[PDB]
């Protein structure tokens, strides 16, 4: 599934991401735009053998079990396949664990390079 901007915003607010640990809702919408263009079925194979899954491109080296990533960890206790669902519930929940580390949204390179320091309110204009 490919969410529209306001569709994704609504879903994220319902699943508790507006002002989760100081990150206003637009930080998350912006993150999803540049990570995956709002596409829950996005995947990208990294050179080490891991894969980024889902709308927030969560990585199999640490966070989920895809069965084919060497020396990996599954911190979110979920199979990576569940991060390809249209329903974002399990991605949000794993994203919350990630962001609750000291590193914050630095976990997502695309947020750091293109969202951090900008006006993120724009990403929820008119929804």
């Amino acid at each position, epitope marked *: 599934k490919v969410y529209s901007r306001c569709e994704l915003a609504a879903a994220m607010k319902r699943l508790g991401l*507006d002002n989760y640990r100081g990150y206003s809702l637009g930080n998350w919408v912006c993150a999803a735009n540049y990570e995956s263009s709002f596409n829950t079925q996005a995947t990208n194979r990294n050179t080490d053998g891991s894969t980024d899954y889902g709308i927030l491109q969560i990585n199999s080296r640490w966070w989920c079990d895809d069965g084919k990533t060497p020396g990996s960890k599954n911190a979110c206790g979920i199979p990576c396949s569940v991060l390809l669902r249209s329903d974002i519930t399990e991605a949000v*929940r794993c994203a919350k*664990r990630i962001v609750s580390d000291g590193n914050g949204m630095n976990a997502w390179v695309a947020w750091r390079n293109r969202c951090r320091g900008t006006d993120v309110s724009k990403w929820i204009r008119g929804c």
Partner: antibody
Amino acid sequence: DVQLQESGPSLVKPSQTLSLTCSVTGDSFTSDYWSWIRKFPGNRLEYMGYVSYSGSTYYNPSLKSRISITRDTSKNQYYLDLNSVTTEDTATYYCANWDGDYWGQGTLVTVSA
Amino acid sequence: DIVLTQSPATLSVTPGNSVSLSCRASQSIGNNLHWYQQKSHESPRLLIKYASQSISGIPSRFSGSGSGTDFTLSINSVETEDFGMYFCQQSNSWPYTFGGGTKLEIKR
């Protein structure tokens, strides 16, 4: 399975440091975040803080720089150091993992002269 | 620090009946509200996470609903074993905080 157990003294004198240890079974230690919670008399729960494998901690402001949470990853253990205790830190102390799935047994620490 | 208000402070119930427990938040916490059970001389046990999401091993008769500021824990067909304290807890904002708690006692 994942199991936790608190250890360390049950009686501490005012102004000394309260030093507790939580020992963890299994392989989850380096992949999870780890917490300390305490229960005061009157069923009052206070979330003291947690540590990630990243080395980063978050501590309750109410503890005013008295609290340290540290990891020893080679031994699957973590620690709580709480400086300059008073009678007000008398409580039951729990270790637990961040999502709340697994908890230790609680250990009652008394602070008194 | 977000304040969580649990009403009422105490319930007494005859087994077989139902109860609803309330937790109110002093600001919007989305769905970031979790529910615990604590029996005497025991550790808290997680019952519901993220307002409505169920936990493996926890009887189906426990459910949760709500969002924003108002949350509800339901226990359908209360059993004698269910007696003890019930605490809500938010993970929206640091520091994490607990409600003052609701005591469930058995009526005889």
